[PDB]
């Protein structure tokens, strides 16, 4: 026979924005039928950043990451009514530009003209190098331009001639030059040497961008997506550094990220838009009106963590780190071990925060009224914190505990525990959590002792805290919980779950290693 | 002069997807530049769905929201060279059709020959051309895991204009196209308060499934049948099953409708695109933000009186405090089996309230403010347990697990539901001005009850009718009034709407709450 299922009502947050003003962008590029560059990576940056798309296709090309197959200049005529059509009757806060044809370039100054002070923000990146065509853009495009993007080949073409590669006042020069020949004040210059550029015409300012060093191959259209993710920003109304900053960022993500799309015939490749996106099915299954879904659709889990080879070197450096051997024979320096506590106390906050959640995620409210007793106590153990660097060390002044500066391994420690919390599942947070309990624990119980630091010292209760037989027996809870998360959690994401865990352990080692290397 | 800013690292836990092996979707479609419709509106909705999308395009075409301004062909030899070698290099899962030439048609009808049964699964959506349709049913087609027509597109496919009284009718096209299309799976759209109706036809389990659908009062549904096929091409791309690959499909589609955009000229009204971007985040913000960032570069008094003054939120928050529930339990007017309904629905809130009450902790500024949501999970607890005595005394509960066996209503859902998403989506003092109205609103609606409680004197209703009127509930509602302060001195001053609409809402759906109860069995 036949079923009926009901249509669910949009997300209600969601319903909070309707009839959204939503930032507009044109793409006028050719085509990457493959979706890595060109037009249809610009759609989807602009897509990814919550702004609407729209086309001007410049020529239909054949294209993949492995060669252009063939490139077909799309007539005059059709490029003119495309744009014509597109302006008479959208909004256009920006038009981005990346293939662009002698056609196009006719095309689109004739309506830079018409338009004059009414006409939308610029984002002009250069697609060169398979000579009047350099000239067009300088002279027909460049002039209206709010920002070229180009790298340092696009910078030799534009300017007739090669300069060098020596510091950054080279750089320097060339975008200084850039601007006077194009008439566009603003240039960004792109150099993994990773280096960006930005000058600034009218306020004759520099900002240069330090990125991350990612050996990979799959850069394949990172240039197009740069320019759109810039339009898009602007779109929405960001100043040009924050949109740049944005822009950059965003693309260095995308290929951090990157992905496995190709066939391995192949072997550069695209890179990742869409790492933000969450999967709409996702939550519309698991909502909590969703009616119904009566149609549609050996042995412990702790001790293969543990021997993980995944996990194996960032355990391993967690509970045998020196860190605990030079607490335990009393080596370890006074100050060495206050930046530890210091660094502690700055975190129980965020720490607090965390256990928020944990108590929200819990299955049992009996487990959520755990979880607040943890954050119930995080005041007292402020407090017990600055008691001890009261009376045992310095007490300058009662406003030292608000000066504390966070440590880069701090930093990466809280960032990686707000992510998962705020964006993970319950299972998640608790591989995460784990390493937190069970790491202290075997490290300190290795070191029984073995423990030459006077009783009735901080080394000392801290080296007896982590040993007692009671901290044990939370081990033994902590245990349980990983192996009862097997029968719930589906085996094909168990791998996630390994990855966190040995995170974590890295991320603990890290901190343990930045207190042994204080001043 | 120059400065240098430092480029952050990947947010962590989106790294965990790193190498990620991205359901693919190559549509084969005509353009729509302005955006709403054609390849642009699939490679939107595919984005949109995590997914990678890959284009071939049939026809450059000239089109906006207005009309359809030039149509231009691409060349044949284009066409397979788009085809031949995406294919080649490329992975692909899925395939969709949109706008396609007599050129295409034969290109493609070529190729899934050649690939045999190693082929990629296609969606086709009939975009109607005297041999079009017939070339479409006879070429392409009997290749389809799904057909996606229209009631008038059924017309044209079959070739004879039927009358569709009822359902029926509806199941017979798709029966009668099944066999002429030789696609088993078929999923006829339009259909007729109101409702929007598709019906998905599953040939081989000789099975129907109907989608009932909201219906929307707008013009703004320019593109729909393209980023449809698009959503049902990338869930099955990513391996879900085909009912729910059009669950998710319909789902998107009328959620796009519903939210809508803004994006066209005055010069353009009774027509728009639609919203393929309404559960994007804009990364900036999260990225400026974001902790290692390392870069830098109105109302007279209380906020309470102003909220349950404002012409928004007045007619809810009446129809909340003075609601006839209340007086029912005070006057003793109320059958107990109804009043047991809202202690076991309120219990199951109560979880669901204690649980986002620590997000709110979560995402409070300072430890101090964190602390307070902890004396409000407590209160929220202490209810819970006196709901436990009332339906272990009163009522006679003896199963142990009873309480973790509740069916949850409608009311219920749709609140839990509110304040959950607030919680995901929104920020601090969002998800706070969602929580409040249940605080207050339950105070004064009793405090309006004393001394008129005509309850029998240590009867549950009135024990029920004196907590609520109570000092130390006072005091609660006071920690209230000062919280719903201190959260409009951090929030932007332009947004304050948002905060306005939310308290609005909340204040219906407590109404709501109520209502249920009232009119239970």
Redesign the interface.
């Given at each position: 026979?036949?079923?009926?299922?009901?249509?669910?009502?949009?997300?209600?947050?969601?319903?909070?924005?309707?009839?959204?003003?939503?930032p507009?962008v044109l793409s006028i590029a050719g085509?990457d039928?493959?979706?890595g560059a060109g037009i249809?990576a610009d759609?989807?940056t602009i897509?990814?950043?919550?702004?609407?798309?729209?086309?001007?296709?410049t020529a239909?090309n054949?294209?993949?990451?492995?060669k252009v197959?063939?490139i077909?200049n799309?007539?005059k005529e059709?490029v003119f009514?495309?744009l014509?059509?597109?302006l008479?009757?959208?909004?256009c806060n920006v038009i981005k530009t990346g293939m662009l044809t002698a056609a196009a370039i006719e095309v689109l100054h004739e309506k830079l003209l018409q338009l004059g002070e009414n006409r939308p923000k610029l984002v002009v990146d250069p697609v060169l190098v398979a000579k009047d065509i350099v000239s067009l853009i300088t002279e027909k495009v460049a002039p209206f331009a709010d920002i070229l993007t180009p790298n340092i080949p696009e910078c030799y073409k534009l300017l007739g001639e090669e300069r060098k590669v020596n510091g950054?006042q080279d750089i320097?020069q060339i975008a200084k030059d850039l601007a006077k020949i194009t008439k566009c004040s603003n240039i960004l210059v792109k150099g993994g040497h990773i280096t960006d550029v930005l000058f600034l015409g009218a306020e004759?300012?520099?900002?240069?961008?330090?990125?991350?060093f990612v050996n990979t191959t799959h850069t394949h259209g990172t240039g197009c997506t740069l320019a759109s993710?810039i339009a898009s920003?602007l779109a929405?109304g960001?100043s040009l550094?924050?949109?740049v900053?944005?822009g950059?960022?965003?693309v260095?993500?995308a290929v951090?990220?990157?992905?496995?799309?190709?066939?391995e015939?192949?072997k550069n490749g695209?890179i990742?838009?869409?790492?933000?996106?969450?999967?709409?099915?996702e939550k519309?299954?698991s909502?909590?009106?969703f009616?119904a879904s009566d149609?549609?659709?050996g042995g412990n889990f702790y001790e293969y963590l543990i021997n993980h080879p995944k996990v194996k070197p960032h355990w391993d450096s967690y509970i045998n780190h020196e860190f605990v051997k030079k607490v335990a024979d009393g080596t370890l320096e006074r100050k060495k071990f206050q930046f530890f506590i210091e660094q502690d106390y700055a975190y129980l906050?965020d720490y607090?925060?965390?256990h928020?959640?944990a108590?929200?995620?819990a299955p049992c409210?009996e487990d959520?009224?755990k979880?607040?007793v943890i954050?119930?106590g995080?005041?007292t153990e402020?407090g017990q914190h600055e008691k001890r660097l009261k009376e045992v060390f310095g007490v300058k002044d009662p406003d030292y505990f608000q000066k504390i500066k966070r440590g880069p391994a701090l930093?990466?420690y809280?960032?990686?525990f707000?992510?998962?919390?705020?964006?993970?599942n319950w299972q998640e947070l608790v591989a995460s959590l784990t390493p937190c309990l069970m790491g202290y624990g075997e490290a300190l119980t290795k070191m029984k002792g073995k423990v030459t630091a006077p009783e009735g010292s901080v080394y000392h209760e801290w080296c007896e805290t982590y040993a007692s037989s009671w901290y044990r027996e939370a081990m033994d809870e902590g245990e349980k919980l990983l192996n009862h998360i097997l029968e719930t959690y589906p085996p094909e994401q168990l791998d996630?779950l390994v990855?966190?865990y040995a995170?974590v352990c890295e991320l603990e080692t890290n901190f343990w290693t930045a207190a042994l290397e204080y001043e």
């Amino acid at each position: 026979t036949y079923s009926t299922v009901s249509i669910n009502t949009p997300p209600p947050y969601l319903t909070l924005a309707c009839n959204e003003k939503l930032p507009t962008v044109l793409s006028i590029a050719g085509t990457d039928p493959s979706g890595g560059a060109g037009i249809e990576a610009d759609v989807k940056t602009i897509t990814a950043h919550r702004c609407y798309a729209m086309t001007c296709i410049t020529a239909l090309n054949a294209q993949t990451p492995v060669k252009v197959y063939s490139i077909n200049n799309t007539p005059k005529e059709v490029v003119f009514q495309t744009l014509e059509s597109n302006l008479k009757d959208m909004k256009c806060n920006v038009i981005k530009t990346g293939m662009l044809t002698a056609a196009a370039i006719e095309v689109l100054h004739e309506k830079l003209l018409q338009l004059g002070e009414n006409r939308p923000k610029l984002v002009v990146d250069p697609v060169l190098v398979a000579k009047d065509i350099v000239s067009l853009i300088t002279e027909k495009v460049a002039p209206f331009a709010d920002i070229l993007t180009p790298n340092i080949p696009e910078c030799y073409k534009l300017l007739g001639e090669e300069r060098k590669v020596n510091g950054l006042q080279d750089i320097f020069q060339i975008a200084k030059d850039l601007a006077k020949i194009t008439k566009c004040s603003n240039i960004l210059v792109k150099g993994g040497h990773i280096t960006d550029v930005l000058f600034l015409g009218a306020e004759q300012k520099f900002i240069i961008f330090k990125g991350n060093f990612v050996n990979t191959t799959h850069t394949h259209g990172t240039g197009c997506t740069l320019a759109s993710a810039i339009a898009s920003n602007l779109a929405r109304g960001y100043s040009l550094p924050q949109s740049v900053y944005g822009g950059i960022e965003y693309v260095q993500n995308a290929v951090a990220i990157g992905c496995d799309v190709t066939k391995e015939t192949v072997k550069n490749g695209p890179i990742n838009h869409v790492y933000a996106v969450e999967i709409p099915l996702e939550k519309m299954l698991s909502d909590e009106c969703f009616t119904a879904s009566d149609v549609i659709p050996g042995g412990n889990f702790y001790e293969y963590l543990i021997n993980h080879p995944k996990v194996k070197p960032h355990w391993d450096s967690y509970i045998n780190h020196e860190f605990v051997k030079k607490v335990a024979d009393g080596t370890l320096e006074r100050k060495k071990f206050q930046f530890f506590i210091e660094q502690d106390y700055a975190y129980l906050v965020d720490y607090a925060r965390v256990h928020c959640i944990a108590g929200s995620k819990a299955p049992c409210l009996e487990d959520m009224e755990k979880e607040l007793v943890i954050v119930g106590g995080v005041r007292t153990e402020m407090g017990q914190h600055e008691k001890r660097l009261k009376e045992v060390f310095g007490v300058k002044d009662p406003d030292y505990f608000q000066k504390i500066k966070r440590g880069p391994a701090l930093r990466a420690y809280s960032r990686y525990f707000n992510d998962v919390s705020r964006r993970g599942n319950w299972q998640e947070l608790v591989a995460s959590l784990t390493p937190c309990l069970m790491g202290y624990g075997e490290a300190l119980t290795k070191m029984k002792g073995k423990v030459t630091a006077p009783e009735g010292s901080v080394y000392h209760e801290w080296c007896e805290t982590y040993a007692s037989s009671w901290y044990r027996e939370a081990m033994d809870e902590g245990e349980k919980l990983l192996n009862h998360i097997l029968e719930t959690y589906p085996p094909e994401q168990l791998d996630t779950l390994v990855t966190i865990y040995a995170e974590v352990c890295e991320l603990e080692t890290n901190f343990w290693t930045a207190a042994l290397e204080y001043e």
